[PDB]
């Protein structure tokens, strides 16, 4: 018959860290275990990777049962990067795929036209300055050049160059490129040269700022932003990598998270399964890449690390949870509260 | 890990603290014993005396209020204990019930240190602590015959009207209460029929995702999982499994994450369950 | 009645210096005088200007009574040359009468040529950039790149490439070629004579610290002028090359004709000879007085001739004057020196 | 400039040297006086003695041989004088003619020290002095009645003209196959004795000679070239007042100095027309 009170019962309760508490069969003791939840395993490969700093196993594991094609492209990237190394990866990803002289003055000749005459005057009259002018106001550019190309003056020797750019710049791509080089700038190339010739832009950026990593990285990032905005996703990560901009890459990967989490959902996964697999793959991908760059301030990124933390502590692995918590700003009372809980829990 | 012979009489509840490091146990011997559990090692800290009959349940307050524990017992009282410098002492007592008190649960912390209390007198009492120390309680007639359990819903994600909690009684009903400013108390939101015998426990899931989940467990050997998608909408009844369990079910408990349920029955068994795509429930770890 | 001997008579004889010796009506006296030979007067002006060295009057006289048109030019050249002076003369006679660019919109490296050169540039390979340009009709670029380095050889391999295919399709190009490689031989010898004042500036310009060469070319040019109808200008060039020899030679060839124009002007064989020989000598005197100046046979011979017309006037002082100017190595000059000396002393 | 009373007996010749500074005179007194002229003064330097008859003429030799003077006289001899070391001494004597010698003249120096002599014996003698001193002259019969004058043609082929009492003027040229001067041209134009003949020194194309006569006329003989004949041109259309005795050409300008009996001296020059007029 039913009774109001005192019946035996396991009175089980879940506790922090993935612990299950219950009263023992005899009913006078207590049991505290860490139950097996199918699909809920402790991430030992990441713990290993993070400690050894060897991501080969982790990279390979992901490389096997990878999801969409873009994600495959990403992991493959990390595979190579992990092999050749950050420097070698960049060198290979940015890499590319006398004459006739005999003039003999012959016969008689004469100066015809007020032009060919006044200039000749200017010359012998030892007045190279005006000679250049008259050559230019007239359409005798090679003449002006050959002359200035024989003087050691600069202001003049460059008045000719500006004249050249002034009328040919817009009529020739080579001319337009020479311009930036002559003016020692790349702004025009980074912003307007065909995104297909990006490796040229890059190399240009490199050869103009060899002693200025800040300017170089800024340009390299400008070019990267552009590549991305033009559908060249993979080449944008390469430029970003070369500039040590983990933020840019992080943002790209964050914006793509929702869609990724949706493809897993369609793969007949529950909300939990989808969220969990998506998050883990995102964090592993980030951690690995974060290892080969030169860098957590992003607002959304912190919230996800905090989501990864909870999925981690529920596997009981307070060691991994601690690792990630320490990489977050202690100025965040969320991160602050979390650290404390884990600390006390594992300590 | 195991802590053998914690008590001489039967133990009725064992709850770890917010850190999963400290643990309290209560028994028919009328005491509460506090333990500190490390790895596979433990240490009895103290034994709490004061109750005059079996102690049914205990709960831990959030750490931000200090190291505090609440207990309830057959004697009809709820007692509050505190640890100040490795030593424990009764710091308060709540005794507004004319019968056994079956459950006590600290409210979500955002609400301050609040206590939800269920008694066999048919009433539920909500208790907070004044600045001075004493307590001012809210009392409501919640179920005919008796109340056996009352669990808090998660804090909405500081408005007081959004506070809800679920009760379960010996009248077979599962009820939902919401705080109402005007009435100055908790009022009936819904009545959930679906059990043919006494509801022994109710637990609201803390899960933070669209649907809300609650579990009722009964003497009729069933576990119902209630779900709600709309704030003011109806709750859907979903049997944990189509057939009755071997024996009575006494408690249900949700995991902090993953939304995994842990059931406790008369055959002294504990089953774990999770929800699949078909929106149905299945074992969460190697069935037995 | 007629008699064989002892008759009275002046028995006149002419004696050196234009002297007329005779016997007086008494038959016992001798008389030495200098007859007034109309048309034959001593040349004072020349003697006074040869001392005071102010040919203002002498120049003026000839100018006033000048013969043909050409001769008139010569004297005027000396009339002004007298006032303004040599240096100022050659001056007046050898003188004459868009940046920016803002790049806009998208663009791209189209073609293998551009791309190749572009890559060379960035790869800091300026040297090869020029090669790839020239091996294509991209010379303006080859030059612009080359106008941006220092490397001479490269900064010059371009010029040579320019002249290689342009100096022949443009006169200005051919002129630059000569100014570049520091030379004039091409100009001085093949540039149209009509642009001589330019070929002159090109010599003063390329040889400012080397007068020996300057005058060679200058003289080389002067001949080209004369032998192409530009007589009046060829003398200018000579006058600046300090080659009195060239001016002389020209004038000694023009001697014949200038003497015949006088003969037709109703003048006897002697009046023309004397007259011509005079104007010539004076002109040569005044001119030689302004240039940086005798080893010319004909010139000497004709100088000797003027001496005789001179002594016949009695002016032994002028005769000696010119005598000295002649080479003391010439015996005829030697003998005449002795004679005029004893005749005057 | 005058030198009155240079001699006491009528003077017959006064000739200056290659410098026109020194001068010689001669006359009936049979002597030759040497003078020196400057501004308007003079100073006798010597008086030459030797001739046995009145002295007719004298001629100065070229300086490249020394200071020398030749004289000839009615005595039929030619005497050479020389001023060596400051004093005059008769270095040689020429006398092959049998009558008065009326002229003696030094050849063009290019010929060397030669002397042209003419005598009333009708003969002409040419004298060059041997290396030792003696003289081996050439004698030629030149005119009937007598030869009054003889002058040399300018140096180029060597020629000289004579004038005689037969009224003829004659040109002579030296011939090899003859070893003497032979008659080249006989010019007729005077109607009385020819007193003097003078070949102009002018080097111009045309040759000029002047003959003077007892007939009171002067003829200028000209020859355009070797192919042209000697053309006769009267100095003036009308006869002169008295006998003409001498003719002399200037060294330049081809100006003629005519000496008349009226003791008058007229100077002449040629004009565009080829005719003569007062110079």
Tab-separated table of C-alpha atoms in Angstrom, chain A residues 96-112 115-117 119-121 123-126 128 135-136 140-143 145-152 157-170 172-183 188-189 191-194 197 200-201 203-205 207 226, chain C residues 96-110 113-115 117-124 126 131 133-135 138-141 143-150 155-168 170-181 186-187 189-193 195 198 201-202 205 224:
chain	number	residue	atom	x	y	z
A	96	UNK	CA	54.477	34.059	-58.281
A	97	UNK	CA	53.846	31.396	-60.925
A	98	UNK	CA	72.148	43.976	-74.670
A	99	UNK	CA	69.680	45.444	-77.191
A	100	UNK	CA	70.174	47.116	-80.593
A	101	UNK	CA	72.410	50.201	-80.359
A	102	UNK	CA	73.895	51.709	-83.513
A	103	UNK	CA	73.304	55.282	-84.679
A	104	UNK	CA	75.491	56.818	-87.369
A	105	UNK	CA	74.804	60.427	-88.431
A	106	UNK	CA	74.469	60.459	-92.221
A	107	UNK	CA	74.334	63.107	-94.923
A	108	UNK	CA	73.123	66.685	-94.616
A	109	UNK	CA	70.065	67.842	-92.704
A	110	UNK	CA	68.352	70.940	-91.351
A	111	UNK	CA	66.174	72.175	-88.527
A	112	UNK	CA	62.622	72.761	-89.705
A	115	UNK	CA	60.017	74.203	-82.464
A	116	UNK	CA	62.944	72.024	-83.548
A	117	UNK	CA	64.772	75.371	-83.826
A	119	UNK	CA	64.817	73.881	-78.575
A	120	UNK	CA	68.104	73.405	-80.401
A	121	UNK	CA	68.853	76.993	-79.403
A	123	UNK	CA	70.351	73.397	-75.751
A	124	UNK	CA	73.596	74.830	-77.162
A	125	UNK	CA	72.665	78.060	-75.395
A	126	UNK	CA	73.346	75.964	-72.307
A	128	UNK	CA	68.518	72.974	-70.561
A	135	UNK	CA	59.635	70.213	-75.493
A	136	UNK	CA	56.726	69.486	-73.142
A	140	UNK	CA	57.812	66.137	-77.685
A	141	UNK	CA	57.967	64.091	-74.495
A	142	UNK	CA	60.710	61.575	-75.354
A	143	UNK	CA	62.728	64.653	-76.260
A	145	UNK	CA	63.010	62.910	-71.220
A	146	UNK	CA	66.183	62.171	-73.173
A	147	UNK	CA	67.271	65.676	-72.167
A	148	UNK	CA	66.368	65.584	-68.464
A	149	UNK	CA	67.709	62.029	-68.460
A	150	UNK	CA	71.034	63.720	-69.205
A	151	UNK	CA	70.951	66.382	-66.492
A	152	UNK	CA	71.587	65.967	-62.795
A	157	UNK	CA	64.311	65.828	-63.805
A	158	UNK	CA	60.984	65.170	-62.063
A	159	UNK	CA	58.895	67.855	-63.750
A	160	UNK	CA	59.231	65.584	-66.760
A	161	UNK	CA	58.049	62.552	-64.825
A	162	UNK	CA	54.943	64.344	-63.579
A	163	UNK	CA	54.254	65.537	-67.115
A	164	UNK	CA	54.406	61.908	-68.273
A	165	UNK	CA	52.025	60.673	-65.586
A	166	UNK	CA	49.769	63.678	-66.115
A	167	UNK	CA	48.689	62.555	-69.578
A	168	UNK	CA	49.521	58.881	-69.852
A	169	UNK	CA	48.583	57.794	-66.357
A	170	UNK	CA	44.917	57.211	-67.241
A	172	UNK	CA	47.946	52.899	-69.544
A	173	UNK	CA	47.918	50.477	-66.625
A	174	UNK	CA	51.691	50.103	-66.722
A	175	UNK	CA	51.882	53.891	-66.700
A	176	UNK	CA	49.543	54.094	-63.710
A	177	UNK	CA	51.624	51.498	-61.851
A	178	UNK	CA	54.884	53.288	-62.605
A	179	UNK	CA	53.236	56.320	-61.042
A	180	UNK	CA	52.761	54.762	-57.622
A	181	UNK	CA	56.238	53.308	-57.720
A	182	UNK	CA	57.759	56.622	-58.744
A	183	UNK	CA	55.791	58.296	-55.948
A	188	UNK	CA	46.189	53.240	-55.511
A	189	UNK	CA	47.234	49.614	-56.089
A	191	UNK	CA	42.395	50.051	-53.582
A	192	UNK	CA	41.985	49.849	-57.368
A	193	UNK	CA	44.254	47.331	-59.112
A	194	UNK	CA	42.356	44.223	-60.187
A	197	UNK	CA	46.698	40.734	-59.440
A	200	UNK	CA	51.491	41.867	-57.124
A	201	UNK	CA	49.865	44.337	-54.745
A	203	UNK	CA	54.622	42.047	-53.054
A	204	UNK	CA	54.424	45.795	-53.693
A	205	UNK	CA	53.298	46.412	-50.115
A	207	UNK	CA	58.844	46.049	-50.955
A	226	UNK	CA	38.916	43.960	-50.240
C	96	UNK	CA	70.030	85.465	-82.221
C	97	UNK	CA	66.908	87.450	-83.134
C	98	UNK	CA	51.179	70.201	-67.081
C	99	UNK	CA	51.732	68.207	-63.878
C	100	UNK	CA	49.455	66.503	-61.287
C	101	UNK	CA	47.448	63.379	-62.229
C	102	UNK	CA	44.906	61.727	-59.955
C	103	UNK	CA	44.375	57.952	-60.338
C	104	UNK	CA	40.708	56.969	-60.703
C	105	UNK	CA	38.584	53.833	-60.542
C	106	UNK	CA	39.408	50.200	-61.247
C	107	UNK	CA	42.132	49.121	-63.648
C	108	UNK	CA	44.239	46.045	-64.281
C	109	UNK	CA	47.432	44.731	-65.776
C	110	UNK	CA	46.336	43.541	-69.198
C	113	UNK	CA	54.207	42.568	-71.273
C	114	UNK	CA	52.770	44.895	-68.645
C	115	UNK	CA	52.530	42.164	-65.998
C	117	UNK	CA	57.487	44.676	-66.293
C	118	UNK	CA	55.213	45.455	-63.341
C	119	UNK	CA	56.480	42.416	-61.439
C	120	UNK	CA	60.078	43.439	-62.152
C	121	UNK	CA	59.423	46.858	-60.668
C	122	UNK	CA	58.001	45.675	-57.346
C	123	UNK	CA	60.574	42.887	-57.090
C	124	UNK	CA	62.883	45.896	-56.875
C	126	UNK	CA	64.639	48.032	-61.905
C	131	UNK	CA	65.092	45.352	-70.646
C	133	UNK	CA	60.367	47.498	-71.846
C	134	UNK	CA	62.847	48.128	-74.671
C	135	UNK	CA	62.308	44.633	-76.104
C	138	UNK	CA	57.630	50.788	-74.385
C	139	UNK	CA	60.557	53.199	-74.532
C	140	UNK	CA	58.925	56.156	-72.790
C	141	UNK	CA	58.474	53.867	-69.806
C	143	UNK	CA	63.106	56.170	-69.870
C	144	UNK	CA	60.825	57.058	-66.936
C	145	UNK	CA	62.064	54.068	-64.980
C	146	UNK	CA	65.629	54.961	-65.969
C	147	UNK	CA	64.985	58.562	-64.944
C	148	UNK	CA	64.362	57.159	-61.480
C	149	UNK	CA	67.635	55.362	-60.720
C	150	UNK	CA	71.313	56.317	-60.581
C	155	UNK	CA	70.650	55.332	-67.268
C	156	UNK	CA	72.513	55.456	-70.599
C	157	UNK	CA	71.654	52.189	-72.340
C	158	UNK	CA	68.235	53.814	-72.770
C	159	UNK	CA	69.481	56.960	-74.532
C	160	UNK	CA	71.503	54.893	-76.981
C	161	UNK	CA	68.319	52.932	-77.649
C	162	UNK	CA	66.471	56.201	-78.301
C	163	UNK	CA	68.974	57.540	-80.801
C	164	UNK	CA	69.219	54.024	-82.219
C	165	UNK	CA	65.858	54.399	-83.974
C	166	UNK	CA	64.959	58.091	-83.772
C	167	UNK	CA	68.018	60.218	-84.494
C	168	UNK	CA	67.434	59.484	-88.183
C	170	UNK	CA	64.021	63.665	-86.610
C	171	UNK	CA	66.544	66.489	-86.944
C	172	UNK	CA	66.089	67.539	-83.326
C	173	UNK	CA	66.816	63.969	-82.275
C	174	UNK	CA	70.017	63.942	-84.340
C	175	UNK	CA	70.981	67.251	-82.690
C	176	UNK	CA	70.396	65.888	-79.181
C	177	UNK	CA	72.559	62.891	-80.079
C	178	UNK	CA	75.421	65.295	-80.734
C	179	UNK	CA	74.897	67.394	-77.609
C	180	UNK	CA	74.629	64.237	-75.538
C	181	UNK	CA	77.786	62.459	-76.696
C	186	UNK	CA	78.255	66.126	-87.127
C	187	UNK	CA	76.621	69.535	-86.854
C	189	UNK	CA	79.812	69.404	-91.152
C	190	UNK	CA	76.251	68.334	-91.985
C	191	UNK	CA	73.766	70.684	-90.336
C	192	UNK	CA	72.246	73.081	-92.840
C	193	UNK	CA	74.430	76.148	-93.285
C	195	UNK	CA	71.542	77.292	-89.109
C	198	UNK	CA	73.528	77.503	-84.004
C	201	UNK	CA	77.038	78.338	-80.300
C	202	UNK	CA	77.571	74.575	-80.261
C	205	UNK	CA	79.354	75.552	-75.764
C	224	UNK	CA	81.875	75.745	-95.289
